[PDB]
Design an enzyme around this catalytic site. Structure first.
Site, PDB file in Angstrom:
ATOM      1  N   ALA C  13      54.880  59.481  24.524  1.00 58.60           N
ATOM      2  CA  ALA C  13      54.418  60.913  24.781  1.00 58.60           C
ATOM      3  C   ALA C  13      53.199  61.154  23.924  1.00 58.60           C
ATOM      4  O   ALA C  13      52.370  61.874  24.157  1.00 58.60           O
ATOM      5  CB  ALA C  13      55.632  61.784  24.306  1.00 58.60           C
ATOM      6  N   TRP C  18      49.202  58.423  30.137  1.00 54.58           N
ATOM      7  CA  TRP C  18      49.085  59.058  31.318  1.00 54.58           C
ATOM      8  C   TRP C  18      47.547  59.280  31.668  1.00 54.58           C
ATOM      9  O   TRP C  18      47.177  59.206  32.693  1.00 54.58           O
ATOM     10  CB  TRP C  18      49.780  60.188  31.607  1.00 54.58           C
ATOM     11  CG  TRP C  18      49.614  60.657  33.147  1.00 54.58           C
ATOM     12  CD1 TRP C  18      48.662  61.752  33.619  1.00 54.58           C
ATOM     13  CD2 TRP C  18      50.718  60.852  34.150  1.00 54.58           C
ATOM     14  NE1 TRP C  18      48.689  61.794  34.799  1.00 54.58           N
ATOM     15  CE2 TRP C  18      49.945  61.399  35.125  1.00 54.58           C
ATOM     16  CE3 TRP C  18      51.853  60.202  34.276  1.00 54.58           C
ATOM     17  CZ2 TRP C  18      50.532  61.702  36.488  1.00 54.58           C
ATOM     18  CZ3 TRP C  18      52.434  60.198  35.788  1.00 54.58           C
ATOM     19  CH2 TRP C  18      51.604  60.722  36.787  1.00 54.58           C
ATOM     20  N   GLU C  28      37.828  52.350  36.776  1.00 56.07           N
ATOM     21  CA  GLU C  28      38.421  51.172  37.279  1.00 56.07           C
ATOM     22  C   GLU C  28      38.756  51.154  38.732  1.00 56.07           C
ATOM     23  O   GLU C  28      37.966  50.392  39.344  1.00 56.07           O
ATOM     24  CB  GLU C  28      39.805  51.128  36.403  1.00 56.07           C
ATOM     25  CG  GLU C  28      40.883  50.042  37.177  1.00 56.07           C
ATOM     26  CD  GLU C  28      42.121  49.774  35.892  1.00 56.07           C
ATOM     27  OE1 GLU C  28      42.226  50.376  35.091  1.00 56.07           O
ATOM     28  OE2 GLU C  28      42.631  48.903  36.479  1.00 56.07           O
ATOM     29  N   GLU C  34      38.307  54.319  46.988  1.00 54.17           N
ATOM     30  CA  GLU C  34      37.559  54.548  48.363  1.00 54.17           C
ATOM     31  C   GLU C  34      38.415  53.711  49.590  1.00 54.17           C
ATOM     32  O   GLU C  34      38.578  54.005  50.536  1.00 54.17           O
ATOM     33  CB  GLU C  34      36.196  53.746  48.272  1.00 54.17           C
ATOM     34  CG  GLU C  34      35.645  54.160  49.847  1.00 54.17           C
ATOM     35  CD  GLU C  34      34.184  54.163  49.711  1.00 54.17           C
ATOM     36  OE1 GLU C  34      33.707  53.584  48.748  1.00 54.17           O
ATOM     37  OE2 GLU C  34      33.507  54.592  50.513  1.00 54.17           O
ATOM     38  N   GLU C  69      23.437  54.604  45.616  1.00 53.53           N
ATOM     39  CA  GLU C  69      24.225  54.403  44.451  1.00 53.53           C
ATOM     40  C   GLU C  69      25.547  53.273  44.743  1.00 53.53           C
ATOM     41  O   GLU C  69      25.342  52.114  43.888  1.00 53.53           O
ATOM     42  CB  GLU C  69      25.390  55.594  44.179  1.00 53.53           C
ATOM     43  CG  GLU C  69      24.405  57.051  43.616  1.00 53.53           C
ATOM     44  CD  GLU C  69      25.354  58.144  43.527  1.00 53.53           C
ATOM     45  OE1 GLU C  69      25.764  58.436  44.375  1.00 53.53           O
ATOM     46  OE2 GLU C  69      25.301  58.477  42.347  1.00 53.53           O
ATOM     47  N   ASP C  95      33.877  38.389  60.764  1.00 52.82           N
ATOM     48  CA  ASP C  95      34.145  39.481  59.637  1.00 52.82           C
ATOM     49  C   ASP C  95      33.910  40.977  60.307  1.00 52.82           C
ATOM     50  O   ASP C  95      34.546  41.910  60.200  1.00 52.82           O
ATOM     51  CB  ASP C  95      33.264  39.532  58.351  1.00 52.82           C
ATOM     52  CG  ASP C  95      33.590  40.577  57.331  1.00 52.82           C
ATOM     53  OD1 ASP C  95      33.861  41.563  57.634  1.00 52.82           O
ATOM     54  OD2 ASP C  95      33.968  40.004  56.283  1.00 52.82           O
ATOM     55  N   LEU C 115      33.141  60.612  75.413  1.00 56.74           N
ATOM     56  CA  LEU C 115      31.982  60.248  76.472  1.00 56.74           C
ATOM     57  C   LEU C 115      31.976  60.973  77.761  1.00 56.74           C
ATOM     58  O   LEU C 115      31.260  61.719  78.260  1.00 56.74           O
ATOM     59  CB  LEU C 115      31.490  58.858  76.883  1.00 56.74           C
ATOM     60  CG  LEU C 115      30.224  58.570  77.239  1.00 56.74           C
ATOM     61  CD1 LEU C 115      29.098  58.904  76.214  1.00 56.74           C
ATOM     62  CD2 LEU C 115      30.103  57.394  77.806  1.00 56.74           C
TER      63      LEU C 115
END
EC number: 2.7.1.107
Lengths: 121, 121, 121
Positions: C13, C18, C28, C34, C69, C95, C115
């Protein structure tokens, strides 16, 4: 001399070579596919295209995964067999403009059109 | 000493240097363009933006080609003149968060907003 | 032997560990984020998803910056610590198909669906 009346079809028929072309899609043209379509998909789109764009969501979502799969392909590609297109020549700087050219006429227009709708809709 | 009343305009006028700036767009800033706009395009977007997003389709479509043109630029860029930004320092790991930061406030919000509309619309 | 009734909570605590997990997000997991989301974001999306896609605009716009980026991350990644996924094996060619597979069922369908709406809407 075998006038070849249809004996070839029998041999080829038993070879089911057609299947080879089916797998080639993702087992060869998997790369050219993403491009070849953009051609076929544009021919019709040009004729008429005014959906809810919903299709994009599915793409945008899965596209997130692509950056992990595709980008992991390109990044490794240069390290793998490295075989970029032969068109390479107009420097890398113009490479960006080369695209902006085709759309330059479109964006500059549609960009102001849609942006304008922002006023009311 | 030539007080330069306007003789420079005559020389520059015959030089039509202005044209050089026009071509520079795709013949130089072709890269910075995609960025510079995002600045000018955001200033107005912020003021108001609520179109049908249709603009995205055109982008999403042509964007497919970009991955073949742009990515073929970046991939070769590192191999070409390699001149990434100087900002590079906050590691590549944070590089992802660096973007998620600006939108973190937006996405976390709008993400739940639009997702909620899924319930009814 | 300390049966550890709750003395650990007191120590932890005061350590507010946390917080370490909160920063880890962008400090990290900024990369895995993402991806991890795309999983959590899909679970609900599957349940129901029919918004105005407006969310995409915000993404599409900021996405322009990402290419500056993120791409500046990947491009440098291969040059940095280079640590692609271990899954790498099914060649780089597949891939692309590896992704087209999951959506192949979706696109081929939704692609023709949206479409088609082009005819009327």
């Amino acid at each position: 001399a075998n006038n070849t009346t249809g004996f070839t079809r029998i041999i080829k028929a038993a070879g089911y070579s057609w299947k080879g072309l089916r797998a080639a899609w993702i087992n060869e043209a998997a790369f050219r596919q993403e491009g070849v379509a953009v051609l076929l998909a544009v021919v019709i789109a040009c004729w008429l295209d005014v959906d809810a764009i919903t299709r994009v969501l599915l793409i945008s979502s899965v596209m997130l995964v692509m950056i992990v799969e595709i980008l992991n392909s390109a990044i490794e590609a240069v390290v793998d067999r490295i075989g970029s297109e032969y068109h390479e020549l107009s420097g890398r700087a113009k490479d960006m403009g080369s695209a902006a050219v085709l759309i330059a006429i479109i964006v500059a227009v549609i960009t102001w059109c849609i942006l304008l709708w922002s006023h009311f809709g």
